[PDB]
Amino acid sequence: YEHVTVIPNTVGVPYKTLVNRPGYSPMVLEMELLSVTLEPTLSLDYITCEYKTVIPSPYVKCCGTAECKDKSLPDYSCKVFTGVYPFMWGGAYCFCDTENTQLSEAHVEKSESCKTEFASAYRAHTASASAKLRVLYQGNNVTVSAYANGDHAVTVKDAKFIVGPMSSAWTPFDNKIVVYKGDVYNMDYPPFGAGRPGQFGDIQSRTPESEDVYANTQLVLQRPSAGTVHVPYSQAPSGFKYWLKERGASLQHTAPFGCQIATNPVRAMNCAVGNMPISIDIPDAAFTRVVDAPSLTDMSCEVPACTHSSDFGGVAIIKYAASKKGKCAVHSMTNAVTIREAEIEVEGNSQLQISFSTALASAEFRVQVCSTQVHCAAECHPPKDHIVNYPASHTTLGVQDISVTAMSWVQKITGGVGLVVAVAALILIVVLCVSFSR
Amino acid sequence: RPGQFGDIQSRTPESEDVYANTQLVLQRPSAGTVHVPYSQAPSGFKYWL
Amino acid sequence: RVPKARNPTVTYGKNQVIMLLYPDHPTLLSYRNMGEEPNYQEEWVTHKKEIRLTVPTEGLEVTWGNNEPYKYWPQLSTNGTAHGHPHEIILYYYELYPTMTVVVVSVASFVLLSMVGVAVGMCMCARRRCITPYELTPGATVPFLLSLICCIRTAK
């Protein structure tokens, strides 16, 4: 027998569904999403990390001009300063005061830390969902874990559950993403080879092991001073070291839909978006013939209490007579009322209680308790508590539609004005008739 | 109330009887240490000062 | 090893958490809606403070220092009631359907007090089509019975 249904994507709220097969005793599944995971597909554009600037000991030419020399290194510059007259601790390093030169050279390179402290910049272009689901079937709680891409049917207690694909393509991740040590950010980072000084991506590297460094630190060598031997320079500080301070908040803290984030691999989790189709194949031998089950008759329903809380604030008590000892599936025929139970024991000529939850201000619903249906109605009161630590366990209200008994004022005023209109239209049609016939 | 003036109270400075409401909550020790960690609202009097 | 900030003293208002915070040292407070528009906000608190966060229908997530997030949802609560006199049922739907309510009671009133205007208008369009020949005749004696559609006085 093939059953198909749609559960909202909300994690941690259990949903009932009814497997009504005519001629057999109905059975009720409860299933609850424990966790939905969206894992995107990542293409690495580059690493970014703290550079070091490499400055050899300077060449000083005593009595002559050094020649500037050109070579390919990631952000290389070289310059010759003239008239520099350096002192070491024991005396002048050159003979003579003037016509000396100093040659200075520098280039930038990845630090030893780039094996350990790197942002990684990626494109993240499509996603492959998974779900962990608890299902209550023939009175056993059982937990099952599955891919939710619409394939991967998972067996459990000989039924087969197949889940997804999810009804929306939404993800927190933009087309471009960067990740640090377990935190991930949406940002439109600069393309490879387009990086600018003092910003994210001032140094770039195609992989964490490539020698193809690009860098644009705007390094400038400056003239030495006061007969000192050193090399002074100006460059923009590491745009990575700045980004670690400037970041803002990781997507774990800012994503919509109550979403959570993780890394190794990167995932979005628990997004309260859309809904998930699910299908059950239940083997023909799992059903009990309607004559071999319990059956219930002469039943009636009473509602002692009804608070429209988030958390089973109503209780209904059902009188019944029953033909044999056994479990019965219990289900609501009205989407606005959720029942906590799923199967209850039935015996004798007696009564049972169900706890239920609703947003209705005047509950009316039909309960089905093993094939027999009973109409059940109550007057509700609001909770006193304002705030709670759990989501609403019931389906949300049909706004501008449902309302209450004691909204009878809508009938008692529309069935006032509608008569004032009808008498006005009558008198107009009467005098239209007398204008011809009299 | 906790963490506000009067979170601890007594009838006179010599009295033996005390009311106090500091919302003290004990917490699980850090797996290997013998200590007792806890969470509490800091003294409402020392904040009032 | 990093510290975990102290439990905040929390108390609940209609669509609000009121939180009294005890930082030992500069601590980040952040919060977001769990809805489509996350509306993220944060602040370092450096001394004892009180915050009042509006908790929307979708729920609020509040994360305080290195603690795990707190989560809060509103639930349908009011001083009004359905099943009361009709002013109380209107005050009741103003609980948490105020956007639905102010739309639907205003446009319902607009069609209702429009319809009584159109009803009196059709009665006047009828009364115009009716009395016309009794005005046009030179024998202008409107009958004592018909005079009641003209609204003329005394059972003379």
Q: How many angstroms separate the CA atoms of A239 and A75, rounded?
A: 15
Report CA-CA distances (Å) from A208 to A44, A120, A185. Answer: 10, 9, 19
Instruction: Compute the C-alpha angle C35/C36/C41, nearest 5°.
Output: 70
CB-facing half-sphere around the CA of A241: CA atoms within 13 A = 11
With residue C103 as reference, give the H or E element that holds it: helix C98-136
Report CA-CA distances (Å) from A385 to A34, A403, C11, C83. Answer: 27, 22, 11, 21
Report CA-CA distances (Å) from C26 to B39, B47, C45, C48, C66. Answer: 17, 17, 6, 10, 12
Q: How many angstroms separate the CA atoms of A367 and A333, rounded?
A: 6
Strands (DSSP E) along A282-359, which ranges? Answer: 296-306, 314-322, 326-332, 337-339, 343-346, 349-358
Residue A141, token pair as written in the block:
């709680």
Q: How many CB atoms lie within 10 A of CB A81?
A: 18
CB contact under 8 A, B39 and C9: no
Minimum-distance CB partner of A386 among C14, C100, C116 = C14
Minimum-distance CB partner of A253 among C40, C84, C100 = C40
Resolution rounded to one decimal, in angstroms? 3.5
CB-facing half-sphere around the CA of C130: CA atoms within 13 A = 17
Q: Count residue pairs from A and C with Cβ separation < 8 A.
A: 132
Q: How many angstroms separate the CA atoms of A125 and B31, rounded?
A: 43
Minimum-distance CB partner of C129 among A272, A310, A435 = A435
Ordered alpha helix ranges (H), A150-280: 239-246, 251-254
Distance from CA of C75 to the nearest CA of B (A): 26
Token pair 């990542």 is at which residue? A42
Q: How many angstroms separate the CA atoms of C79 and C73, rounded?
A: 19
**A35 in the Ramachandran plot: left (φ > 0), alpha (ψ -120 to 50) or beta?**
beta
Among residues C80, C92, C102, C72, the alpha carbon closest in space to that of C8 is found at C72
Residues B8 and B19 sit within 8 Å (Cβ to Cβ):
yes
Query: Would you call A1 an interface residue with chain C, using a CB distance cutoff of 8 Å?
Result: no
Q: Is the peptide bond before A165 cis (omega within 30 degrees of 0)?
A: yes
Q: How many angstroms separate the CA atoms of C89 and A281, rounded?
A: 47
Query: Would you call A386 an interface residue with chain C, using a CB distance cutoff of 8 Å?
Result: yes
Q: How many CB atoms lie within 10 A of CB A424?
A: 21
Residue C105 is given by DSSP the state H
CB contact under 8 A, B3 and C7: no
Chain B residues inside the 8 Å CB shell of C9:
1-3, 23, 41
C-alpha dihedral sign at A399, A402, A407, A409:
positive
- Give the dihedral of Cα atoms A292, A293, A294, A298; nearest 10 deg: -80
What determination technique applies here? cryo-EM
Distance from CA of B16 to the nearest CA of C (A): 28
Question: Which burial class, exposed, middle or buried, applies to A83 when counting CB atoms under 10 A from its CB (0-12, 13-18, 19+)?
Answer: exposed
Secondary structure class of A430 (helix, strand, coil): helix
Among residues A316, A282, A375, A261, the alpha carbon closest in space to that of A20 is found at A282
Report CA-CA distances (Å) from A236 to A17, A51, A56, A178. Answer: 63, 11, 20, 22
Ordered alpha helix ranges (H), A247-347: 251-254
Q: Is the pair A, B in contact (3+ CB pairs within 8 Å)?
A: no
**A323 in the Ramachandran plot: left (φ > 0), alpha (ψ -120 to 50) or beta?**
alpha
Minimum-distance CB partner of C74 among A387, A417, A431 = A387
Which of B39, B48, B49 is the best substitution to test chain C (most C C-beta atoms within 10 A)? B39
Q: How many CB atoms lie within 10 A of CB A264?
A: 7
Which of A9, A10, A386, A421 is the best substitution to test chain C (most C C-beta atoms within 10 A)? A386
Residue A114 is given by DSSP the state G
Distance from CA of C63 to the nearest CA of A (A): 9
Strands (DSSP E) along A191-258, which ranges? Answer: 203-205, 213-215, 220-221, 233-234
In DSSP notation, A338-366 reads EES-SEEEE-SEEEEEEEEEE--SS-EEE
For residue A250, the one-letter residue type is S
Q: How many angstroms separate the CA atoms of C67 and A252, rounded?
A: 14
Q: How many angstroms separate the CA atoms of A294 and A131, rounded?
A: 35
Token pair 């942002």 is at which residue? A119
Among residues A357, A316, A317, A378, the alpha carbon closest in space to that of C83 is found at A378
